[PDB]
Amino acid sequence: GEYVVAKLDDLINWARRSSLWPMTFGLACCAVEMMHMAAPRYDMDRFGVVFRASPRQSDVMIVAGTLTNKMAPALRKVYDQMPEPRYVVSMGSCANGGGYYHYSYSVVRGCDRIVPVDIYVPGCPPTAEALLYGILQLQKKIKREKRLRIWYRR
Amino acid sequence: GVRTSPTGEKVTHTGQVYDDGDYRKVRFVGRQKEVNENFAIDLIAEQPVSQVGSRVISCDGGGGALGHPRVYINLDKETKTGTCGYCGLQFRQQ
Amino acid sequence: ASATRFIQWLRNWASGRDLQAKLQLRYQEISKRTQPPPKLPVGPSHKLSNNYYCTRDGRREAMPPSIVMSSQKKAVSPAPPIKRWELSQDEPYL
Amino acid sequence: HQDLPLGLMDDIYEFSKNFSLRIDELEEMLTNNRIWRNRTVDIGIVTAEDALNYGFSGVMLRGSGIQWDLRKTQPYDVYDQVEFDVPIGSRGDCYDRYLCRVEEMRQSIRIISQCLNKMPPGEIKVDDAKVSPPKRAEMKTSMESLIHHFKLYT
Amino acid sequence: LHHAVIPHGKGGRSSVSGIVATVFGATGFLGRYVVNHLGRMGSQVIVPHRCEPYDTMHLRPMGDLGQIIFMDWNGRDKDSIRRAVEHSSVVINLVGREWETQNFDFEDVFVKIPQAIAQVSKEAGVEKFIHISHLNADIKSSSKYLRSKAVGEKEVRETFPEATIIKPAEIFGREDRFLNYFANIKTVKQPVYIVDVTKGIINAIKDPDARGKTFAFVGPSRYLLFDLVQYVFAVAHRPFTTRDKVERIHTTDKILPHLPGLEDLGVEATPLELKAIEVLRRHRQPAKTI
Amino acid sequence: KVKQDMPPVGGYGPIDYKRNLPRRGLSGYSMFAVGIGALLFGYW
Amino acid sequence: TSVKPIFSRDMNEAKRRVRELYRAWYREVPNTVHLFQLDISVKQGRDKVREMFKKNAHITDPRVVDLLVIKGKMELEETIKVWKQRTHVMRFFHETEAPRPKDFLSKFYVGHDP
Amino acid sequence: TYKYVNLREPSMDMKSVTDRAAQTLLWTELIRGLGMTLSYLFREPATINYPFEKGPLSPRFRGEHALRRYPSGEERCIACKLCEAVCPAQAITIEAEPRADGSRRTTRYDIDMTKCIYCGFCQEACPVDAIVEGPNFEFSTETHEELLYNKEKLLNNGDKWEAEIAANIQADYLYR
Amino acid sequence: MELLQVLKRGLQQVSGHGGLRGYLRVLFRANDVRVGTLVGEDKYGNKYYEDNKQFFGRHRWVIYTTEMNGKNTFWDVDGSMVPPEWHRWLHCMTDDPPTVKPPTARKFIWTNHKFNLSGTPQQYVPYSTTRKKIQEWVPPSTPYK
Amino acid sequence: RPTVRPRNDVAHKQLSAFGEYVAEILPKYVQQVQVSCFNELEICIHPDGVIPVLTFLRDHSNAQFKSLADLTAVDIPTRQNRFEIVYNLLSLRFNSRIRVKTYTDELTPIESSVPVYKAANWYEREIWDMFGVFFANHPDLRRILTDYGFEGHPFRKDFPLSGYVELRYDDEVKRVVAEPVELAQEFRKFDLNSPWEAFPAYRQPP
Ligand SMILES: CCCCCCCCCCCCCCCCCC(=O)OC[C@H](COP(=O)(O)OCCN)OC(=O)CCCCCCCCCCCCCCCCC
Ligand SMILES: NC(=O)C1=CN([C@@H]2O[C@H](COP(=O)(O)OP(=O)(O)OC[C@H]3O[C@@H](n4cnc5c(N)ncnc54)[C@H](OP(=O)(O)O)[C@@H]3O)[C@@H](O)[C@H]2O)C=CC1
Ligand code: SF4
Ligand code: SF4
Ligand code: SF4
Ligand SMILES: [Zn+2]
C-alpha cells in the first residue's frame, strides 16, 4: 500500500520532470538568454526540455521579460489554457518584481500578480546558466511532489 | 553577541526582535530567522590598541588601495585612544 | 581536435573546407585565465604644474545658441553637396 | 568604465581569425538555396524614394540602392580612421537586404581587425574628474578626488 | 491594539487591514473567496493546508508579498492547529466535505475537527472565531451530513461561546456543487450567492455585534426544486453523486425568522437570476418564486 | 612601466573576411551525361 | 479670446457631435454585451454610457467638448473592433473596488484623507 | 566606398545555361547544403555538461550581492548612502544611527533583488569596498519574498563568499 | 586501424574509473565517463578533475559528493554545492586551484559552505531590521478618574 | 586640448548662412533662428507654417531634407503653449541636419505632416498618446503605446510617474482588474541640485 503509492509517485514525478516542455513568453531581453540556454553550449534539449512547445502541449511557462499592463491579460489567458500539471518560471528582475521599470505607470510589478509562480530566477538578465539552474531547481521541486501519497490519505 | 529574547527569538546586532504580542513573528513558523552571528561591534573590540610614537598617525584600513580613504588621527588626548572613523582601529601615543 | 583522420577527411569533404584549421571549439590558443597585474597609464591632466582647471574646462566653454534671426546675394545650401561615393577596389562586386 | 583586461585582445583576435568561415557556412545554407531565395527574392520591395519618405534607415535604405551610412557620412569616434565598404543592394527586396547584412558582418570583421592593430595606449575615460570619476586609488588618497567621487555618484 | 495591527492605507492590496486570520479549509470552494477578500484589503492570512502545495498555488496572487503564509496541518494533530492559530486575531473554519472517505467520516469533518480547532483557538487566546454550519442542520435529519452539522454546531457553541456561527443555505457560484450539480445531471430551496456569503463572513469579522451570534445566510427568493432544475436547464441551453447528497438536495430550506441574516451584516442578497448565467455559461424565463 | 592590453609588436596576422564559396562538382554537360548513362544501363 | 477650433465653431455645433456619439454608443452596447460575453445587462451597459456622458454635462467650451467626443470615438472604435478585451470593457464598472466612505464620519473612522 | 552585393549578369552561353539547367533538375545546390549539415554531424558538439561543468566567467562578473568586512571583522560599510543614491533602480534602502560604541553604522541595509538590475554601480560608488556583487549566480528561489535581502542576509553572503570575493577583487582592483 | 585505437580508448575509461561499477556509477550520476586528472578534493567530498586536451569549458569539471550537510546527493546534485574557494577555479575565474593558491583565512568566513536552501526550513525569511520608531504612552495601572 | 571638444567654425558659418536663407524665404512663419555651439541649426516657426515650411525644406533644391529623422514633443508647463513640437530632418544631398520647432497648447490642433513625410504617421500618434496633442487631418489618430482605455497622457510633466491605476488578476471575477495604485515602497524623491551656480554663461538676467 504505502510502498506502491510511493513507487508510483516516484515514477510519475520522474516522467514529468524528465519531460518538461516549456512555453516561453519571450517578452524582452531575458528572452535572449533563454535562446542561449537552447543554444549548443547548454542545449536544454539534452535534459528533455524541448526548444519550443505549443501552449496546449506545455508543462511550464517561462516569463522571460517585462510584463506590461497591456500584455497582462494575454499572459493570463495563455496560462489558463495550459493543461495541468502546469508550472511558471519567472525569469529576471522585470518578471520577478518589475525591476528597472518597477515604478512605471505601464508595467506590472511582478508577474506573480497575474499568475502563481513556482521559481524566481534573479538577474537582469540571469545568465543562461542561471536560468538552467532554475529549470533544474524546478525539476527538483517536481521530484518532491507526493500527489498520490496525499490522495491515498484523504 | 547573539542573545535570545524571553520568547526565544534571537536578537540581531541592530537590536531587532519581535515583541511578545507581534503577529509578524508568524513568518518564522516552520522556517527560521536569519541572523548573522559575527557581531562587528564585538569583533572590533578584540583588536589591540596600537602604540605609536607620534602625535598624529594615519590609517587607510590596511591593504593600501583596498582599504578606506586615508585619514589622520590626532593622539594628543591622554585620557582616551584615537579611533579611526572608518574601520574602528585604535591608536595610542606611547 | 580528437577526431580520427578518417572522420576529419569525411567532414572536410562534406563541407568543402579545411575545417581543422579553423575549429569553432577553443583549446590552448586562448589567453591564460590568470594574468600578471596591469599598470595603467594616467591621462594628460596628471601634472603638478601648468595645469589649472580653468584652461581645460570643457563644460564652461559651452555657450548659449547664437541667434541669427529673431522676430523680436547668392543662394546657399546647408553645406556643400555630398561627394559621390567611389566603388570599392577591394571587391566591387559580390 | 574600465580598461581592457590583459589578454582580451588576443582572444578577440583568435575569434575574429575564424569567424569568416562561420559566415561561409551560413552562406552555404542560405545564399544559393532555391527555397531561401523563393522566400526572400522580390519580397517586400521598397523603392529608394519611398524608403526615404517613410523614414527608413540602415539596410532598409541601402538595400534599395541608396548610398548612405552614417559611419561614412557623419562619422563619430574613430570611424573616420578605419577602412570598410558599405554593401549596397539593387532590388530593394528581402534577399538583397539579407545579402547586405551578411556582407556587413564581413566588413565588421574587417573593421575589428584594424581596431586590434591600431589600438593606442593611454587612459580610457576623460581626464576631467568633474565629469568622469577618479581612479579608486586617487579617491582614497586625495581630498579633491574624494569630493568629486562623492558628488558624481550622488 | 498592538501597533503592528493598527489599520493603515486606503484598503488596497498594499494596505494594512489589521486582520490576522487563520483560514482552515482555505483550499476549497468557499475558502478561495474568503482568502481573496482578506488579501484584497491587505490582511495577513495563514493558510493551513493538507493538500499538495501545487493545490494551493491559486491563493498566492491573492495577497501582497508576505501576506499569505502556508502551513502544513493535520486535522487530528492539535499541535499543528496550535502552530497555525497562536498568532492570529480571528480563526475561520471552512473545513467540510460533501462525502465520507475511508479516513474521515462526517463526524470527523463536522464534529471532531471543528471542536479541536475551536478548543485550541480558545486556549491560544484568539479573540474571534467564525464557524460555518448549515441552514438545515438538524439532529432529526435523514442526512448524516446535516445531523453532524447540528452536533458540531452545538459543540462549537459550548467550546467557544463567543464564536460567530454562520448557517448558509446551498451556495451557488462558479465552483459550487449546486448549480453545477444540476447541470451535470415538494422541496423548496433558498440558495445564496457565494460572494454574499463571503461578504457576510468578512463583515462578521469587523462587526463587534456579531460575536456570540448565529446567522442564517439565504438568498432573496425561494424556489421549488423542480422550478430551479428546470430553470437551470433552460439557462444552460440543455434539453430539459452520493445518496446522502440526494437527501440534502431534497431537504426544504428552513425558515428561521429568529436568526439574523445577511441584511444584519450590511450585505444585500444577490438574486439567482443575475448570477446564474455566470455559473452556467460554460455548460452551454426566470423560475417561479414562492 | 605602463602595462595595458596592447597588440603584439608588429601587429596580429591577417584576418580573412571575404566570401569564400569554393567551386565544386562537374559541368552541366557531364552531370547530364552521367544521369543519362545510368538510365541507359538501367534500361539495358 | 480668438482661438483655433478643432471641429466645432460653437456649442450648438459641438452638441450635435455629442448626440451622434451618444447614439453610436447606445446602439453598440447590445453587441458589446454579446461579443464580449459580459454578465452585465444591456440596461446596465447603457446606464453606464449615460453616466459617463452626464459627468461632462457642465462643459461650455466647444474645444473641450470636441476633444471629449474625439476621445469617446476612440473608445468606441476600440470596442467595436474588439481591440479591447473583456477586462478593458469591465474596467468601467469597478467590480473589485469596495465602496469608499463618502460621509464625514465614515471617512474620519478609517483614515486621514479629506 | 561601396560594393554591390547582388549585381551580376548570368552568362547566356550554352554551357552556362546547361549548368543552370543541371542545377535546377539535379538539385545540386540543395545537395551541397546537405553536405554542410552532414559535416556538422561529425563535429564534436559545443555542449558542456552542466552542472558538472560551468561556463567560464571573469573576476569582473556581477552576481549576487554581499556586504564585506575588514580583516578584523568590523563592517566596512559606514552608512554613507552613496550606493543608495546611485542605484538606478532604487533597489537599496538604508537607515543608520550611531552604534553603541559611537561607530557610524547601518541599522537597515536592504536590497530588493527583484528591483536590482545587477549593474554594479553600487560597488563602483562605495568608497570602502563594502557592498560588492559577488561571483554567485545560482541563487534562484521558490518565493518572491526570499529575494528581498535585509542586512543579515547580505552580511551572511559576505561571510559565505569572502574567500572568493577577496581573490576576485585582488585580480581586478588595478583596473579600478 | 583508427577505429581500433578508439575502441581501446573506450575500454581504458572503464578501468580508469575503477572497473565496471565505478564506470556505470559516473555514467548514471553525471552522464559522462571521461577520465581526467584529479586536481583536488574539498572537505565535503566533491572531487575536481581537469583535462587540458578538452576544449575550453569542458577542461574542468567536478564530481559532486554523494552526501553534503546531511543531504543525500547521490542523485540530487546542485551547482550551489561548490564551495567558494573551488568556485573560482571551476568557473575559470583563475588558473590555479585552491590546493596551490589557498584563500586567505579570516575568522568570520564560514567554515561550512551551504548550498541553496530555498524550499526548506532553513530558507531565508525577510524582515525589518530596525526598531520601533514611535513609543506609545502607557496609561497608569491604578484607578484615578 | 585633449579633454575639450573641438569647435567647428566652418560648419557653424554654413549653418548660420542657411538659417538666414530659410528666414528670408518664409518670413510669414519663421519666428527665430539659432545655431548651437555644437553646430545644430534650429528654425522656430509659427504653428501655421508647419506644412509650408516642411514642404519647402523637403522639396527646395537647396534644402532637400528628404528624411524625417524624428518627430516628438516636449512638455514645458510654465509656458502658455506648454507643448513644443520638434521635427528633426536629414538631407542626404547636402549631408546636413536641421531642426524645426513649433508650439501648441492642450486645445489647439496642429496640422498633420503626413502629407509631407509618410514617416510622421506613427510619430504623431505617439505624440497624441503621450502628450495629448491633437493632429488635424491625420489618417488614423489613436493611441499607439498605452493600454486600451488608458486615461491621461503619461509624458506630461504633471502625470505621476507610477500613474493612477495598476493591474492584478482577481480570482473572484476571474480576470485582470485595474485598481488605484498603492506602492509597497513609495518612490523616493531626491533633491540633487546644488545651490551653487554651475554655468555662468547661461545666467538669466534678474
Ligand atoms: C534517353 C532517354 C531518356 C528519357 C528519360 C530522361 C529523364 C531524365 C532526365 C531528366 C531529369 C529529370 C529530373 C527529375 C527530378 C525533378 C526535377 C524538378 O522537378 O526540379 C524542379 C523543382 C523546381 O525548381 P525551381 O528552381 O524551384 O523552379 C523551376 C520552375 N520555376 O525543384 C525541386 O524539385 C526541388 C525539390 C525541393 C525539395 C528539397 C528537399 C530535397 C533535397 C534532397 C533531395 C535528395 C535526392 C533524393 C534522392 C531520393 C533517393 C530515393
Ligand atoms: N458549499 C455549500 O453549498 C455549503 C457549504 N457549507 C460549509 O461551508 C464550508 C466550506 O464549504 P466548501 O468550501 O464548499 O467545502 P469544500 O469541500 O469546497 O472545501 C472544503 C475544505 O475543507 C478541507 N478539508 C476537507 N476535509 C478535510 C480533512 N479531513 N482534513 C483537513 N482539511 C479538510 C479541504 O481541503 P482539501 O482540499 O485538502 O480536502 C477544503 O479546503 C464547509 O464546512 C461546508 O460544509 C455550508 C453550507 C452550504
Ligand atoms: S530583467 Fe533585465 S534583461 Fe530581463 S527583460 Fe528586464 S531589463 Fe531586460
Ligand atoms: S547592482 Fe545596480 S541596481 Fe543592483 S543594487 Fe547595485 S546599483 Fe542598484
Ligand atoms: S555599502 Fe558602501 S556606498 Fe553603500 S552605504 Fe555602505 S559604505 Fe556607503
Ligand atoms: Zn582605519
Side-chain angles (χ1 to χ4, degrees), chain C residues 19-76:
Chain C
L19 303 163
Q20 213 69 25
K22 302 193 164 164
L23 291 167
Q24 65 216 131
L25 308 166
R26 293 165 295 166
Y27 290 91
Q28 300 290 71
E29 70 280 2
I30 50 146
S31 90
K32 295 294 136 23
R33 307 300 288 194
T34 293
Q35 297 282 323
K39 172 78 167 305
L40 302 186
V42 293
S45 312
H46 277 74
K47 303 194 299 188
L48 298 192
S49 54
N50 192 40
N51 201 34
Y52 281 93
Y53 189 78
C54 67
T55 69
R56 50 185 177 91
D57 183 346
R59 280 185 321 159
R60 267 53 174 272
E61 296 184 17
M63 296 279 117
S66 328
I67 292 156
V68 328
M69 170 271 170
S70 193
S71 62
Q72 59 107 58
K73 184 150 164 183
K74 302 318 217 93
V76 298

Side-chain angles (χ1 to χ4, degrees), chain I residues 19-58:
Chain I
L20 185 80
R21 200 193 280 310
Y23 175 89
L24 288 178
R25 176 167 147 143
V26 85
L27 173 70
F28 281 85
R29 285 196 78 223
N31 322 117
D32 197 85
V33 291
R34 286 174 318 156
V35 168
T37 298
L38 177 71
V39 177
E41 187 177 340
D42 55 22
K43 60 200 284 294
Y44 316 101
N46 309 312
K47 298 168 163 97
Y48 302 85
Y49 299 91
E50 73 181 345
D51 181 1
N52 288 318
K53 299 186 119 283
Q54 308 291 298
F55 72 82
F56 188 63
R58 299 215 75 206

Side-chain angles (χ1 to χ4, degrees), chain J residues 86-101:
Chain J
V86 187
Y87 304 79
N88 279 289
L89 318 173
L90 168 71
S91 157
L92 284 71
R93 178 62 48 216
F94 305 108
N95 194 16
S96 292
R97 286 177 190 276
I98 191 165
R99 170 153 57 258
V100 177
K101 312 211 295 187

Side-chain angles (χ1 to χ4, degrees), chain B residues 59-62 68-69 71 73 84-89 91, chain H residues 70:
Chain B
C59 186
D60 66 11
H68 58 70
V71 294
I73 302 155
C84 173
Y86 280 99
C87 70
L89 286 180
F91 308 80
Chain H
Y70 286 106

Side-chain angles (χ1 to χ4, degrees), chain E residues 11-28:
Chain E
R13 187 175 174 88
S14 283
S15 300
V16 181
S17 70
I19 292 156
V20 183
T22 301
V23 189
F24 291 91
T27 61

Side-chain angles (χ1 to χ4, degrees), chain G:
Chain G
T1 36
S2 180
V3 301
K4 182 177 200 201
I6 309 193
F7 291 130
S8 306
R9 298 185 64 81
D10 47 49
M11 286 305 303
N12 308 270
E13 286 188 47
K15 274 139 79 196
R16 182 212 98 231
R17 288 162 179 284
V18 170
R19 284 184 237 103
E20 286 174 319
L21 179 62
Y22 180 77
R23 285 159 88 150
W25 265 111
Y26 187 88
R27 295 189 175 280
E28 179 48 30
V29 168
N31 320 340
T32 302
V33 163
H34 183 71
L35 264 85
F36 287 92
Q37 275 182 298
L38 309 181
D39 286 312
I40 58 134
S41 64
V42 167
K43 175 178 172 12
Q44 277 175 266
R46 278 163 178 169
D47 277 21
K48 176 58 64 160
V49 163
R50 184 166 334 98
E51 190 224 281
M52 281 330 273
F53 270 76
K54 179 221 209 71
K55 69 193 231 197
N56 288 311
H58 64 291
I59 306 300
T60 62
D61 183 320
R63 288 176 310 162
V64 181
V65 170
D66 273 5
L67 272 174
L68 285 173
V69 171
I70 280 159
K71 286 177 164 208
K73 288 169 65 164
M74 299 184 184
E75 204 86 327
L76 183 55
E77 176 180 43
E78 279 173 20
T79 314
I80 286 164
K81 303 225 180 116
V82 204
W83 298 342
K84 276 188 213 287
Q85 293 117 82
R86 173 142 78 250
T87 180
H88 297 100
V89 173
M90 294 296 322
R91 268 164 220 195
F92 286 109
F93 294 82
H94 315 277
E95 304 208 326
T96 69
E97 280 83 290
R100 308 225 52 71
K102 266 291 292 138
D103 66 318
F104 180 91
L105 254 190
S106 305
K107 284 141 78 189
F108 171 85
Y109 291 144
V110 310
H112 314 277
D113 276 355

Side-chain angles (χ1 to χ4, degrees), chain E residues 276-288:
Chain E
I277 179 63
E278 171 178 291
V279 184
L280 292 159
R281 193 188 297 274
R282 45 163 267 242
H283 299 270
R284 302 175 160 191
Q285 201 31 282
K288 170 50 139 262

